[PDB]
Amino acid sequence: PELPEVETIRRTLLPLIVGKTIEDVRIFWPNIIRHPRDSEAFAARMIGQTVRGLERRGKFLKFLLDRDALISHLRMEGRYAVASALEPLEPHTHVVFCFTDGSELRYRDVRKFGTMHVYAKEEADRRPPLAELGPEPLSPAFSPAVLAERAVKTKRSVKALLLDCTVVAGFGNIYVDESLFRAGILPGRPAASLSSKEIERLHEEMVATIGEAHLYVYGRQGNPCKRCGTPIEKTVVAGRGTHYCPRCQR
DNA sequence: AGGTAGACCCGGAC
DNA sequence: GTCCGGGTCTACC
Ligand SMILES: [Zn+2]
């Protein structure tokens, strides 16, 4: 899921787990657990803790317990469900938090690609994976000035810049391509080549792309641009498949 | 050290 | 049967 859908998950999941107490943690694929390094320590430490809150930082969910925070990333295909311990698990379930009321929070992922870290709550923001994360794109902390100051000092393309999680939280390949289209800027342009006007327009369209979230360019190669009718093109930029309108973007 | 490459994962596309 | 697609971290120069 993208940032908007993670926010929806955050809002939906919270009432389904708040106030529940962890009785067991069952791990079927240890490598999902990134901290502590031993999945057995990860499981052991969570037992007896009650879920108190659920926050979002970029595409990360931060589960707040009594002492610890669980930081979880679903990437593209991960899913959470709350369901009864009496019922069979869904296929591809890798980690289950069992609660004392006989319900469970389950993480499943056909791609097995997600990650989980647990630290004392007070340490979570200064450790991976949250430590270097840039500002929320819908927050005043993400501004044209912030974007401009990062763009000026780099040799990288504008696409590589917007994909950098330290610049802004939660912009992945789809919203990067779409925002750049909406701003009229080619993804391969050096970040340092953008004028003040272009930086300001790009900020505006990034906020709009995220705020709104239905595609102009992503995956639309060889089909007509919805604004000018020119066929959408696809190339590699910053090591990613990159979609753009060669007329609308400059 | 700024910035790219490696690593993780595997359904489905070639 | 080999490889893309996806995000975000660690490992290099
Ligand atoms: Zn166009």
**A7 and A102 part of one domain:** yes
In single-letter form, the type of residue at position A150 comes to R
Is omega for the bond preceding A88 within 30 degrees of 0, making it cis? no
**A76 and A160 part of one domain:** no
Distance (angstroms) between ligand 1 centre and the Cα of A225 equals 5
For chain A, the domain total comes to: 2
Helices and strands (DSSP H and E) totals, chain A: 6, 11
d(CA A26, CA A8): 26
d(CA A20, CA A51): 6
**A137 and A77 part of one domain:** no
**A15 and A121 part of one domain:** yes
Torsions phi, psi for A84 (to 5 deg): -75, 140
Q: Is A234 a catalytic residue?
A: no
List CB contacts of A203: < 8 A, sequence separation 6 or more: A142, A143, A144, A147
What's this structure's resolution in Å? 1.8
Domain that holds residue A171: 133-250
> If you ran DSSP here, which 8-state letter would residue A154 be given?
-
Distance (angstroms) between ligand 1 centre and the Cα of A8 equals 32
Å from the A76 CA to the C1 C1': 25
**A95 and A152 part of one domain:** no
Å from the A21 CA to the B13 C1': 44
Domain of A236, CATH number, reads 1.10.8.50
**A173 and A125 part of one domain:** no
Question: What is the experimental method?
Answer: X-ray
Q: Is A112 a catalytic residue?
A: no
Taking alpha carbons only, the member of A238, A248, A239, A247 closest to residue A179 is A248
